[PDB]
Amino acid sequence: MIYEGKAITVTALESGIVELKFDLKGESVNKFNRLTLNELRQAVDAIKADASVKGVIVSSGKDVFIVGADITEFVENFKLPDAELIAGNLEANKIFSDFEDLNVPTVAAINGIALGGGLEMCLAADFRVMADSAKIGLPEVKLGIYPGFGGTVRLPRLIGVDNAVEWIASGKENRAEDALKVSAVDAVVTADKLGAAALDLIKRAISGELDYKAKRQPKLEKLKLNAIEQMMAFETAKGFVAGQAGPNYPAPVEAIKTIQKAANFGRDKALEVEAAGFAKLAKTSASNCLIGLFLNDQELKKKAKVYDKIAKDVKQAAVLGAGIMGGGIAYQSASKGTPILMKDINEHGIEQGLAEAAKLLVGRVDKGRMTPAKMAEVLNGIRPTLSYGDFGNVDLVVEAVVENPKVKQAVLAEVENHVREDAILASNTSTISISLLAKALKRPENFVGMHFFNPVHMMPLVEVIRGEKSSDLAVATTVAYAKKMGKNPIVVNDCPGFLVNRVLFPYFGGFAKLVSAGVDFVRIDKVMEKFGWPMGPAYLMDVVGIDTGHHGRDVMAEGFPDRMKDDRRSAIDALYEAKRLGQKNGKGFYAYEADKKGKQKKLVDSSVLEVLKPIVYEQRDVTDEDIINWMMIPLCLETVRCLEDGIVETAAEADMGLVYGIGFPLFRGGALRYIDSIGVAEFVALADQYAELGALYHPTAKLREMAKNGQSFFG
Amino acid sequence: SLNPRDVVIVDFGRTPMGRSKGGMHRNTRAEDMSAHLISKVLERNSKVDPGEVEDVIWGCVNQTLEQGWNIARMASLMTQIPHTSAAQTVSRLCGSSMSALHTAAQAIMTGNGDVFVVGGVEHMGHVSMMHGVDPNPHMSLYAAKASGMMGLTAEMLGKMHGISREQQDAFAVRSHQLAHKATVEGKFKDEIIPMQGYDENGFLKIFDYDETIRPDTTLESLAALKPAFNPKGGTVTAGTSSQITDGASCMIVMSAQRAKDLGLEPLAVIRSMAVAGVDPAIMGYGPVPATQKALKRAGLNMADIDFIELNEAFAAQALPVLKDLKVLDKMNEKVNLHGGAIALGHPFGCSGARISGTLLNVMKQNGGTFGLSTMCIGLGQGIATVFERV
């Protein structure tokens, strides 16, 4: 053949068409390691040298196209000076650039996952065919760096600035439907007819029907945006990200500055820009380990895969208790192709559930987003019941009974005698130990914790609280079942407050202290919202409910008395003892007066000051900068404790749980990454001046240990 | 003297501008609202045979549901207007209603009709703006998507010309204040056509004022609002932005010839028409280009214009336009003397003829000769019209 490497086999085909195949012999996936990039060079030069070639088709002999890059072998090639680094990436880009300069049609038949460098290889070709069951994206940002193989060059000119900035800055994966809409892909087909599409497409490029040359041009010249249109596009992008990324900007805020500069440039000059900025991130922002974020993701994609195919298929499901949480779990399970049973004790309950599930379905149809025929299927998927007669074929059962250790145990143990023995049981509790509930059951191995967040259809995160006697198969099935319901599950070990909530209140502890220090909460949340948080502390408290937060406080206090048991009336007790129960009541830190069906208003009133007076113990002065510390430090440290006590298994999972749950500023990474954004050694120093506030601001021993060692959580 | 094919605006009648968030029109369709207006306006002028109406040009933007399927004809069919007449709906976002006036004007001038019924309508209550929107990703390949958000453009154009939060809020106060005055003094009695509606209690009654107006609007109350399109460092607030308003505006137009024959005194006469384009990012700057083109076509200098009506989309955009038009120091003397879209609301498909109609009443009332009505349009456009009192 033309070329037979260990990673790439350039095989010939009909009509002079050649097929460059990616198949890393020996490994499970394809990736751009040293060996691969080297063989690509040899492959491209081979095809390039061969004048009989009339086209090139790029494929993969794996389940995935080409995943990320195994950066572990590029690390030594980052410690070099910025010149020997830029020129380094430049030389690497010469490959793709040349492949892009091949005087012949080139198509990329994407069969599976094409992330990071994998997609950059595709962006190089002229045309791109994709299987409807595939995904593509540039998650480089999660590593503190942005595309280094022409990603910031081709994507922006291929799909458009706004679309590129979005795809890159976020680093989100994209399905066929979405990839086709923004025109990142040119044709989506079923997995079976992928090869035929690539072949049929190439031939149409050769015949001259399709102008492969005209399609390539867009990513070789300047952007089509006006000088003015650029100012608007970039400044808005930079601005929005600047506010939610904050001071230590990884790939987000930089990626845009790289595109804004290389805007009026062509490929070659744009590559230089991309390379230059890439060096800056690696030697500054990400020097405090890019290795960690990467390997951490590596562990996850494999973990999520191990869980993925040992997991039991959930064809039939059911939920205990209708109404609020039950109607949601039933809705989500129904809208994602999973027949669910709404079990309850009284007819009045089923009514509430069916009603809420109906209100959501009609909500989309009454505007145009859901098909009337679709609402029918979803509704039929949900099957009401007041007994366990049909629980015979249910694979996974979820509990939503009232918050009561005793009650939940009775209910759980009850259903266990009406389902298969190999069926998995899961509680949705939030303040009760899973390891405690499991004791009632006679099959604890199948019992775990599946935590949803109100509203079930709004919040993405679903905690998979593993008990002490929970089998892997149990967790695997639950995790998978969550993903199928369009969620983002994360495995967390059983502990008071689990991960999210356990970290959410210490955060509020810093708030409670502020209010007690004469700090205006209005100023507080305006600063926290300027930090990147969706809702402010005070405002959030109102949404959750002062009565709720008051109960949760006791739940955490009893859990970890050594640091979460304060004993001085705070704004929490003040409002509660003053009948100001929050947003549901109409009065909390703010006032809420309702307009009509779907809208209510947040107002301010000096009457709240009277209630808070008894809480003010000092008229302490504070800067908006300190306000952020009184809040973030307590939250970050608790995360470190959740990682040390073994509540979360990896730092990666310890942050996403905050990103999807509490709503941690996305472009800031997470609680742990934020720490690195300051420097572990420099973070402990910061914590110490606030040590006069309590055990909530005291670095752990393991943190101090890794403080002197210049160790950070991502490595 | 008269030129046979000269465009003449015979009359003008608008509906009471009511709030969309549960306002006085929450139970009335856009079609009917338009049909009733056209019908009532034709009544005041019993000398213009509805049968002569060669065509009814209505402006409307979100043409779907109630406003879809050529609302011009749908609203014209429920009018005394014969089935023998025609009707078309012209959409140009904000300047839809004004473009309608231009289409008829040109028709009359070229001898393709004698009597027309132009105007526009927009019931943002029943057919909200964000309703049924599908952003084409491909647009980001030729222009910033952010430019699609009128607010952000106001912020951008604002920063450039340097307009302070105080400067904007101060403008909003001027608008509300001047709107209330014009209302109380009865400077609206002629243009506003009483119309049935429902009060906050579901009761049936006729309104003849503008709910949108808020007399209590003070610099203090405005300085309390938060940035609507840019929380972290913004000036454009809901207070300095036009209001979401359901409303319709009508205008009977015809040739001076067929007019002279009917012996009916003209309200105004169109001298020049102009439309121009600008970058979407700063669409609010559309007026200046469109105005300059109109002045040149009308052979007049900006100074020759006695009164001006600038659709107040955002205080952040109106002010810059007025500055470059070099008439900011003449504001209180000849610019929006009855308030703007901030206090009177801005019904997309209606604002075009509404501001022009109001412009005429200002001239007639203040003995003006030359008038100018212009407005900014979304996605980078502008439109201007120069009338004349004779």
Add this chain to the structure above:
Amino acid sequence: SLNPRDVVIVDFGRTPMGRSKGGMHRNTRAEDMSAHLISKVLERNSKVDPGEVEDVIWGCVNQTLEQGWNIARMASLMTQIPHTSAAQTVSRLCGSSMSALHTAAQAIMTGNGDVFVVGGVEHMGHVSMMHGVDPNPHMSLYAAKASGMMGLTAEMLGKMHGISREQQDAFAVRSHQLAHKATVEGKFKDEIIPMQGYDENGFLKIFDYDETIRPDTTLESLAALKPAFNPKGGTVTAGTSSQITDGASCMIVMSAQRAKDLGLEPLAVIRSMAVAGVDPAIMGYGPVPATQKALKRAGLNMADIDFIELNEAFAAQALPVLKDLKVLDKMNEKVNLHGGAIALGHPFGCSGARISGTLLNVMKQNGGTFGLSTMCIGLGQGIATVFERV
């Protein structure tokens, strides 16, 4: 010789008419389809500076989702057309595209612009017709609701003039046959602009023909279909009705003056424009009134017209229109020689300029002098245009 302000059609270009039910345009937005067309058409004419385009008048009906928010500008911004130009969307249901041609025409004549880019688009695949419809009950107080159902009107108009099931099916056959003929012989090569699309296998390829055409359409195959709008005694079948088609049509227009200056030979010249109204119940009769008005303004007799383009809404309506126009016995000699909406589909906001554009190609190809393009409109309307080859 021509007068300075005489409207001249420089060029005409349309997209391949593809089926909506999974056709070749199933993955292409209406905006892009239009933007691409306008862009490509301007290319063939390298002597008309896009910057001179005073305005882009685009026709569209269901203006929501992809087609909402003044698609004229949305599609214009992705073109080489500068941001300094303007754009407006004109809706008149079926005759939208044609009204666009008229608006620009009158503009040019009145000295409000020199170069224009008119046309229309309608992607009934992504934005179906029945999508987002809210029937106003009050309409039944002034007109029959049934008149809203184009099909039923075809039935009524048909009954009146007496057109047998065979007479209609035979018409559809003539449309398909003639369409295929013109296609095969390349009588469409000049107007049809090759465009990217996807075949039934999701594969990417360029189409240069009209999927809608069905050569196998025989009287036998059409006599098998059942009444679509009236099962118990009907003649109007899906076969004799226009097709649901996604497509766009473009047309560069300018004054003879600015045209003579560029030394580019005209394609045709507009001599008269007309719009008329009829009762909604028999809206299909709209052409005759609109035509008669155009002929009078053009100072011509129906006999002076060499070629005729009557948009085929239904065989039940086209035939009656041709009979009253007294040219049924001249059909095969000068009426829709390249087929109609029955075989070429009928994109609401597009057909207006498409039929007119094709009309010019017929004249040019067959040495015609005077041409006529007319079509019936929903809710009782009509529109006609009389071109001239010089």
